[PDB]
Amino acid sequence: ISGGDAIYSSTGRCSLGFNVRSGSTYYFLTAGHCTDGATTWWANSARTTVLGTTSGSSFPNNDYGIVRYTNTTIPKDGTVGGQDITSAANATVGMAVTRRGSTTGTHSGSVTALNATVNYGGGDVVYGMIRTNVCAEPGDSGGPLYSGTRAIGLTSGGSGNCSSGGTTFFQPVTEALSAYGVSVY
Amino acid sequence: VDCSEYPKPACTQEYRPLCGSDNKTYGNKCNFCNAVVESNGTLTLSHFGKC
Numbered sequence: 001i002s003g004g005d006a007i008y009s010s011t012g013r014c015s016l017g018f019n020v021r022s023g024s025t026y027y028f029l030t031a032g033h034c035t036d037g038a039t040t041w042w043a044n045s046a047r048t049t050v051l052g053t054t055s056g057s058s059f060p061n062n063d064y065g066i067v068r069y070t071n072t073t074i075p076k077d078g079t080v081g082g083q084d085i086t087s088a089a090n091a092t093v094g095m096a097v098t099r100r101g102s103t104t105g106t107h108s109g110s111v112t113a114l115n116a117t118v119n120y121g122g123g124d125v126v127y128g129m130i131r132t133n134v135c136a137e138p139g140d141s142g143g144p145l146y147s148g149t150r151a152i153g154l155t156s157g158g159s160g161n162c163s164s165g166g167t168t169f170f171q172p173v174t175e176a177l178s179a180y181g182v183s184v185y
Numbered sequence: 186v187d188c189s190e191y192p193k194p195a196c197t198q199e200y201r202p203l204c205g206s207d208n209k210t211y212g213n214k215c216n217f218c219n220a221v222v223e224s225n226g227t228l229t230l231s232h233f234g235k236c
Contacts, residue, residue, distance in 0.1 A: 011199075011201060012199050012200050012201035012213075013199070013200040013201075014199050014200070031197070031199075033197045033199060034199055063197075101198075102200075103200065103212070118194075118195050119193075119194070119195070120193065120195060120196070120197055120215070121190055121193050122190070124197075136198050137198065137212060137216075138196075138198050138199065138200040138201075138202070138211075138212020138213045138216055139198065139199070139200035139212060140198045141197055141198040141199045141200075155198060156197060156198075157195050157196055157197040157198050158195050158196070158198070159194060159195050159196065159219075169195070
């Protein structure tokens with residue numbers, strides 16, 4: 001399973017952000033709004049292929065979560081679909097980026113602003129987000145935003161749709177790697 | 186589902202589908218409620234789950 005693939009929790013479906021590790025321990029990153037209140041994660045709708053269990057979750061304020069792999073057989077590719085990812089980088093205004101998600105597949109665009117505040121309501125506000133003109137739709141949450149072989153962000157939310165065009169905000173991935181002490185591979 | 190606090194400029198994008206009175210599957214409550222608003226209150230909930 002790789003960046004962009006579907007992930008299922010008890011509650012619904014999100015997308016795998018990036019495969020990361022610490023030592024010999026494998027985890028995956030996804031959005032914190034997906035990890036919040038999720039314990040177990042599976043690879044299919046039927047919930048028969050277990051992936052692992054939530055180890056950390058940060059939302060609102062930030063929007064990242066981490067799940068530790070408990071499935072031993074499943075290949076854990078350090079890619080996004082078949083795109084290799086070799087490092088993490090900071091987003092910059094004007095940077096060309098690509099998003100992949102379980103519902104919409106792959107879509108491109110550019111970083112239009114940094115440090116945006118997005119208010120999802122009910123006190124669910126997130127800060128420090130990357131704004132882009134890339135679309136996203138339900139199910140795409142938590143998938144990767146990358147640029148070339150650089151990991152950049154995790155999909156959080158936004159408006160619009162892929163047909164009409166829209167705006168998507170992403171959580172800087174560097175902040176999660178550093179919080180959990182993990183790195184991409 | 187209550188769409189009173191809508192509209193909302195943004196929605197998180199997890200998938201937990203709902204079925205609208207227009208036969209469209211809405212991906213989550215936030216997306217569904219913003220559509221309600223856009224329709225000026227004419228769209229309603231048919232049932233939970235995909236259509």
